Each structure stands twice: as structure tokens, then as C-alpha cells.
Amino acid sequence: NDPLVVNTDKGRIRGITVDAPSGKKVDVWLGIPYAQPPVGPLRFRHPRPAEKWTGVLNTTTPPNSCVQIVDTVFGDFPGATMWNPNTPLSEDCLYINVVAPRPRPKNAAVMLWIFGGSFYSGTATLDVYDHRALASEENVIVVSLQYRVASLGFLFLGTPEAPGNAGLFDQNLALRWVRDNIHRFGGDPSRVTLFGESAGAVSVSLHLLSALSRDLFQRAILQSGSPTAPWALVSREEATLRALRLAEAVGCPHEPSKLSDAVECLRGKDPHVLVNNEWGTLGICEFPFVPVVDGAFLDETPQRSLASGRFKKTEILTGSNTEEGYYFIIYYLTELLRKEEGVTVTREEFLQAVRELNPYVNGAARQAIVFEYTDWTEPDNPNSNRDALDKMVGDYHFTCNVNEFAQRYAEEGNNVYMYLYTHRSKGNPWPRWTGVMHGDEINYVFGEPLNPTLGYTEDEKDFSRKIMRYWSNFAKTGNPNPNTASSEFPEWPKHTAHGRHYLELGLNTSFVGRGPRLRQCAFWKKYLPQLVAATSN
Amino acid sequence: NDPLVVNTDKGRIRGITVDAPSGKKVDVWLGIPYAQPPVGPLRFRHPRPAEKWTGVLNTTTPPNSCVQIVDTVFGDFPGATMWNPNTPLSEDCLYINVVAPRPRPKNAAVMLWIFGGSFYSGTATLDVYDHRALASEENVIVVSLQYRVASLGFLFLGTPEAPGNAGLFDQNLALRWVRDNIHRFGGDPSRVTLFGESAGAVSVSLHLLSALSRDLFQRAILQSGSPTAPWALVSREEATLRALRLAEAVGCPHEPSKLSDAVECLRGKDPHVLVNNEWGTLGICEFPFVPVVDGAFLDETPQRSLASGRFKKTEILTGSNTEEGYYFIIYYLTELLRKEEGVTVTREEFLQAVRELNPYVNGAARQAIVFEYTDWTEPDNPNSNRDALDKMVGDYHFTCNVNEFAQRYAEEGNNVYMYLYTHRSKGNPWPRWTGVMHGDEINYVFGEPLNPTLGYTEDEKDFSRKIMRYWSNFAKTGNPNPNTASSEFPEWPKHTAHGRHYLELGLNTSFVGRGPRLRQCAFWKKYLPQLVAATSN
Numbered sequence A, B: 001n002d003p004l005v006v007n008t009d010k011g012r013i014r015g016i017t018v019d020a021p022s023g024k025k026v027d028v029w030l031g032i033p034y035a036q037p038p039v040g041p042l043r044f045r046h047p048r049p050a051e052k053w054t055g056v057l058n059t060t061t062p063p064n065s066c067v068q069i070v071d072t073v074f075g076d077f078p079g080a081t082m083w084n085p086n087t088p089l090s091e092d093c094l095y096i097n098v099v100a101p102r103p104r105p106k107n108a109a110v111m112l113w114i115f116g117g118s119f120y121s122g123t124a125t126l127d128v129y130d131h132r133a134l135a136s137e138e139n140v141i142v143v144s145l146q147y148r149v150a151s152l153g154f155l156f157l158g159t160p161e162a163p164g165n166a167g168l169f170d171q172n173l174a175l176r177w178v179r180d181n182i183h184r185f186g187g188d189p190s191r192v193t194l195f196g197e198s199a200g201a202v203s204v205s206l207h208l209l210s211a212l213s214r215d216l217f218q219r220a221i222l223q224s225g226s227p228t229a230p231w232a233l234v235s236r237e238e239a240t241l242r243a244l245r246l247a248e249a250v251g252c253p254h255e256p257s258k259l260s261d262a263v264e265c266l267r268g269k270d271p272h273v274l275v276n277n278e279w280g281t282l283g284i285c286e287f288p289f290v291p292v293v294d295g296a297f298l299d300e301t302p303q304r305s306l307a308s309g310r311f312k313k314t315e316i317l318t319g320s321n322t323e324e325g326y327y328f329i330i331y332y333l334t335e336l337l338r339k340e341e342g343v344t345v346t347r348e349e350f351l352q353a354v355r356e357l358n359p360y361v362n363g364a365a366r367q368a369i370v371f372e373y374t375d376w377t378e379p380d381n382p383n384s385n386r387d388a389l390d391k392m393v394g395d396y397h398f399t400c401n402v403n404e405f406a407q408r409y410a411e412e413g414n415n416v417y418m419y420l421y422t423h424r425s426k427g428n429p430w431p432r433w434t435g436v437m438h439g440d441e442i443n444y445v446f447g448e449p450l451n452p453t454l455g456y457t458e459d460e461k462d463f464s465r466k467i468m469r470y471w472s473n474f475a476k477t478g479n480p481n482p483n484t485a486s487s488e489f490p491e492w493p494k495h496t497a498h499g500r501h502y503l504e505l506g507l508n509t510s511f512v513g514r515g516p517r518l519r520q521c522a523f524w525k526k527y528l529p530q531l532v533a534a535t536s537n
């Protein structure tokens, strides 16, 4: 009997034994199909499941990446190219990857990765997401999936041939494949933990809401993303306009009254032409094609689900990084924050940035933001004014939404674990002033420091082992803490509805705090909305 | 020859030798007259100098106190009775006290005290101000003066017979007396340091502005008071109305057109009847009869003098206590902050208090205050909501005005030293939650802990020695620091215009910080004014 041949519910498949960078060995199945290719008449539409096949399908090659724009802003800068697709771009992209430890488990916990990329970019095949270290060091099945992104994943016109959320129905279908099949690979299908970062975290949080995903997994890890983030969803009316603008931009009919003509033309366009024409006039952290409230995957806004307690009763682990804003500002204010060492911002530049980064609020709101984000010890300090820019973008679009979601989960009686990630890698290629940006924790979550061909210190390797152990303890039990309390493994306390404790994740630290950033988050969530209402006659 | 008989420019006077509680001896001259009694036709008017006398005037008895209301809200509670007049009340109250060390110096520095009491109360004769410890431990001439308070000191109608600021002209005349005479008591008239607390500090600061006082002293110490405090001055237009309201309240004519009838009737009323009818409907930290801009003592608002650099160029030492607001709230919101142990404030009680304590601002401003003064770690915590009431009253009426004054003095090149006083006496008679209140430092400045019959600990005795040494180093040299830096005497750095360092004064501490409370002071001084402007249609 060939332990690498597996009889899935649609056919037999053959995997392959390979080495993790550490030397430990894992079994691997790459590019398992879970849907019909979403091509031709099927573009923009929800996935159909895969047709049965005869024989043995060799599932040993990393799959196609879904069509998306490629980032060339900084040339071959490694900090940017690590997020670009590393396999051929194709609409034929609906595949899953399974990576199992050796020897093969019987009922192991299953960690299912959903990649981020602001819903317009990303792929499960990235080297930074390599599954071999995590599976082999922690004894879990690691699963990853492709899902459609950008307008191919999220075009919405409010018609059956453009119903929205195709990329989310892709993820749901993959979740169903995992529950139907993962036991054949040594995983317990009742022990699936979803984890994802940024738009992948938003995606995970939406599976905590949807009635269609409710029974498809056990618990969730949400790295720097939450469904109350203002970029996370778009209204149905605005999505419809954005789709029609895309149709115009590529030469298609775009009349609100004859939506059939517009969809049909869009289905005939080259896919690269579509994703390369999506980017109109949008503010920072506004992405053109994102989830909507459609009626079937979600039938109410996330804020209404949270207010009413309509979400899955389970544990969650979630957290933020210290410099969440810079990554997005570096690409948006390219004259102000050049990607050079020693950048600073003058007071007059900061005041101009506040208007550009908050383009929708009135005069009174901007002053409040200025007051809230000024260092009153030294108002004109050019470092303080640069850091203020990161914090106001990072608080509003990231940190404060994670806090909000973790709060509601905790108020409703669920165990919550909250982190603030503060480690900057010794080999970080970005300018020193960028600090700990969006996504930096991913390398450590997937155990990349254990790769002996890379430059990580021994301290960083221990750190990555600590983090993988927290993450996988949580998947295995719902609690990141070990049984025997360690010197290397600090205690990670629950984030209670009233304590709101969080654990700082870093090299030489076990600091537990509150929040984080409760005051700035109250500014955005409580003070500023009532001031906008008061001054909008 | 009798060294206790001194020939002043108006006559001879006889003093008396007494003991310090310190064990050392001092010479003392109490009740030296410096003006004609301001009685009869002279009521409300500026002082005339004292008429010459033959013989030897026995100056050995603490002088009369100026007429003022007596506080009975808490009966014989020691925390309150220590501020009540301890000598008979009379309009015949314009006297000075001099206390010299033994053996008598030749050209000693002179520390001249101006009592506080919100311009309606106070007296130089209080036991808490007793001069003997400071004079004998620090080898300085200690001087104190009476000045008229309440409507008797500060009635203004804009006519020659109610010209305003009589109490400040009293202080000016006393300052003159000191420069004409203090060398006969062993003091250098070119080395007068003014010091005062609360309305006494305001008074000191107004002598730093007035052209009539400019050459009458060398430097200044300002404890918890500044001329930018919103209670420190009243407009000429409002002063006139308040005076006319007082006339009405006591049955006098009060027609805005016939001011002579009103003044002449007021000159006939009993002085106690006058001061007991002053208290109309006023907010917290609003006192009816206070300085005005008259044309002669001051001819522009303090803020206009500060902005234009028209103020005396000299060193200043100044500071705040940590709970500046509670004292006034305890007397204003007597149902909410009962003088009992274990008081707390509910969230709903706090929101009502914000409206009562900031009764002039609109809805938007109140929300900003609420947001600024909420503990966002635990918004509903009833200790936090009680402390917030102290901080919003103390910041707005005290701490932030001291900061502003020290800031402007530093920007103009003068040496400034800033303290935050944080010591609560072990024997404090107020409830524990009141913290370190307005006026608490006065006992330590005057060396009261060195009286062994009071209950002070040994550490508190040391603290008082340290503080008298800082204060008198400052009077002697312009710098509170000693020459040989000690472990008992930390370094007190200058408060520079951009560093804004302060020294925390307390038992087990040498902490240096910035501000204090730069962010909250920016809220009152920069943010809230621009938000009121924006929302005032």
C-alpha cells in the first residue's frame, strides 16, 4: 500500500515526501482541485464543485496563482517581491494544498491558512507561507487554499451573473472539501482552526459570521484584521457603481438599466486587463473590489451581527503589530515617505498628510485628529510627526477593529487571547524607521527562521518556536499556554471583557498590558463619530 | 541701646525676641502700620501711606485681619479652621510683620509672603504661615503683609471712588515700605523674593507685570497660581455689574447712571454685611471681587503682556500639586463629594458633574471634556470618575495656567524652575481620596514639621528642610540647587522653553518629568478653544 496515494471523494491523488528546511520530512499534496475552473461563462460566479476523475492525479506541483496585478513599485526590492505571485497566473486557480507530518497522524489538529492581500492580491504558494516547518515542528496538518481575488473574486452588480463574494464562496467550498476529506490525510475534521492575516483575517472573521460556514471549522486565529475595518466591506450600491466604472474603463457597456450587457462584455475581456484597470480615485486603505452583504454568504452587516450576538461561539486568538500604518502609507504618499533611511516629517507636512489620509471628514474632525495625534511633549519633532502618521492610519484601519472584535467575542462569554507583536527582525530590509510593520509576524508563525540558509539569529529561532507553539497549542486545545508553565513560555492571560489584557510578543519581554491603545481606539470608535454627527448640518 | 527698637521712616517701633519651635531664637515685629486705616470715606479706595508717630510703637501683637466671611461649612474640622482668621476682624487691617534671625544679619535676602484665599479671604496671621522656622533655619528676613480682600479690596465701578484693585495697591504700598525700611531690620532691599500661593501667587505674578511694582522686588515664587487662570481677573464691564448687584442685595441704590449714590451708600454699610452678600450665582472657581485692568496698576490683560514680553525679566520658581481641583469641588458639589472616607462617583454622576462644572460650554465642548477626562481602560470605574473631576477642575483652573506662565517666562530667556508637589502628609485630616490638595505644600514651605509637638514623622521633617532650602537657595541666588550636589538634595533642572522639565517634590523621589500634564494642558489651551469657535453659529 502506497501511503502517498489518497482516495479523495472525487478520485485518487498522489503526493510526495519532501524535506522541511530543518531536515525533518513531511508528506505533501500540492494543487488538489476543489472546484471547476471558474472560466468562460463561470467568471464572476460562485464556484461549482470539482468533477470526479479516473486514475491517479499527481498532486505534486504548486498550483497556479489567481490573476492579480504584480507589484513593481520598488523593482526587485525583497520586501515587496516576497508578496508577488511565485507561480503562473491563471483563472484556473481553485486548488488546495495539504501538508502532513511524518509519521502520519490519525486525528491531528488542522491549521487552515487563508492568505491576505487586501482582497486584490495574494496566493497560497508564497515561500513565506511555507507549510513544512509548521507541520513538522508542531505536529499539525497544515492546509492552504486559493480563492479568487480582485474583481474576478468580488465583482458585484446585484444580478445573478454578478452576485458578489465569489472569492468567499470559493473559501467556503474549500472548507467543505477539508471536512469531507482531511481525515484521509491524518487530520481530525472536527479540529480545523482557520488562520489568516489581514484580508485573510477578515475572511476568517466572515466565516465566524456566515451561516454557510458555521459548522465547517472549530476555532479561529485572526492576525491584524477584523470585519469592522472600514476597508473590509463595501455597500451594495457603491460596489455596483465600481463594477460599472470598471466596465467603462475597459470599453464595455455600463448602463445601470442593462446590466446583462455589462456582465457579458466583462466576461469576454482578458483577465489581466480587468485587474489592471480597477484602481480609480480611492483613499488610503480603500480597495476597489471587496466583500459585500449579498444575502446568502452574509445577510446583514458584520456590525449588526456583532451587536446581536449572531456569531460562532468559539475561542479566538487575535492581535496587532506596532506599526500597522506605514506599509500602506509607503505606497500611498510616495513623495512624503520615500523608502529611504532617515525619513522625517515636518509639522506642516504632517498637517497636510492628515487631510490627505482622512479625505472624507470635515474641518472639525481633522482638528480632532491633529489634536489626538500630536506629541504634546514636543509638537514639531519630525520623528513624532512621522510616527503619528503610522499610528493614525494603523489605529483606524487595523488595531482598533481587532480590539472591537475581540471585545464582542469576550463580552459574549468566549475565551479570547490578544497579542501585540513588537519584534523587528535583524534582517528586515525596510528602512529602520518603519518599525514592526503589517505582516512581519507571518515569517515567525510559519517557522521561516528555522531555515538554515536564511540569516535569522538563534534568538529569533527560539522566538519562532515560541510563537508556533502558542499558535498550535491554541489550535489543539483553545488555549495557547502549555500545561507545564515554562521560563521560555510566559503566561498568556485571557482577554476578558473588562480586563482586556494582551500579551506583548517580542524577544526579551513577557509584558502584559491592556488594550492595546484603548484611548486612541475610543477616539475613533466613540468620540469622533459623535463629533462628526454634531457638526454636519 | 535696644536692638529690638527700630527707627522706621515714620517712627520708632519695639519688637520682641521669641523662640522658634526649632529651638533657635528670632526677633519679631508684628503689626507695623503701613497705611492710614482705610475706613469711612477711604473705603474701596487706594491706601494712603501711614502718618508719622511720636514715641515708640509696641509692635509685638499679631495684627487685625481684614473683614471677610468665615467658613463654617464643616464646623470645627481642623482642615477648615486652619484657614479662618485667627485674630480680630477689622477694616483697620493694613499692617506688616517682620521676622529676623539671631544674630541679626547685615544684608540678608528677604522673603516676602502674600497670602492666598481666592481674593475674598485670608490673613498674614495664620499659624500655618508662622515665619520663625523659615527665618531661623535659612537665615533670611521673612516679611508678610495684610491687604484688603472681597468687595472691600476689589470693588470696581469705573469711577474715582470705586477705582478697583485697592487690595493690589495695598500690596504695592507694603512693597514700598519694605524697600524704604527693611535694611533697618538687617535685610537687603535689593534682594526681596515675593512668594505666595493661589490668589497670593496671582498677586505675585501681577507684580511681575505692573509698572508700579517693577522695581520693588528681585524675583518671585508662585505656588499654584498664575494670572492667566480664568478666575484671576474679571472684565471691567462684569465687575461693574457685580458691584451694582452687591448694592442691590444690601438695599442701596444701584442705577448704572448714578454711581455716586451707590458708592456713597455702600460706604455706609457694615463691612460684614458687605462681604456676606457677595455670593450670587457663580460657577466653581468663580469669585465675585477679584483684580481688574484698571489703567494704573495694570493697563492691559495679563495675556497681552505675556504675548508682548511686557513683564519683569527675572527668575521664577513655580509649581502645582497633584489634586488641585478637589478642594473647590468639595465646597461646590457638597452632595456628590461628601467629606467622608470611601467616596466614589458613578459614571452617570460624572456625566452630570461635567455639565455642572463646565456650565458655559456647548454640547460639543462637553463631549470633548468627557472624552478627554474618561479612563478608557475602565470607563465606568467609580474611583476613575471621581479623580476625573479633580483633574478637569485642577487642570483648567490651576495646573495649565502655571504651565503657561512658566512657558512664556522661559521663552523670553529667563531661568524658570517648575515643581509638581506630590507629598500627602501622614496626618492629613481630609479623606484619603483627596490626595495632595491645593495648599498642602504650605506647611512644608514654612517648616511646620519642625514643631515636634505636631505629629510629623522624621522623614517629613527632612522633606521640609529640603523644601525650605530649595526655596531659600532660590531667594538668595536665583537657583534652588546647592553648590555641592547632595544625595539628600537632588538636582532641580531648569524649565526650558522646549524641554519643560519639572522636579517632582515628594518623600522617596527625585523623578524629573516634562510638563506636568502637557497633553491635558494642550486640550484646554489649544484644542477646546478652536472647537468652541467652530461650533458657535
Ligand SMILES: *[C@@H]1O[C@H](CO)[C@@H](O)[C@H](O)[C@H]1NC(C)=O
Binding pocket: A056, A057, A058
Ligand atoms: C504520475 O506519476 C507516475 C509515476 O509515479 C507516472 O507514471 C504518471 O505518468 C504520472 N502522470 C500522471 C498524469 O499520472
Ligand SMILES: *[C@@H]1O[C@H](CO)[C@@H](O)[C@H](O)[C@H]1NC(C)=O
Binding pocket: B014, B058
Ligand atoms: C510699650 O512697652 C514698654 C516696655 O515694654 C511699656 O513700658 C509701655 O507702657 C508700652 N506702651 C504701651 C502703649 O503699652
Ligand SMILES: *[C@@H]1O[C@H](CO)[C@@H](O)[C@H](O)[C@H]1NC(C)=O
Binding pocket: B508
Ligand atoms: C524607595 O523606593 C525604592 C524603589 O523601589 C524602594 O525599594 C524603597 O523601599 C522605597 N522606600 C520607601 C518607600 O520608604
Ligand SMILES: [Cl-]
Binding pocket: B309, B310, B311, B312
Ligand atoms: Cl515692560
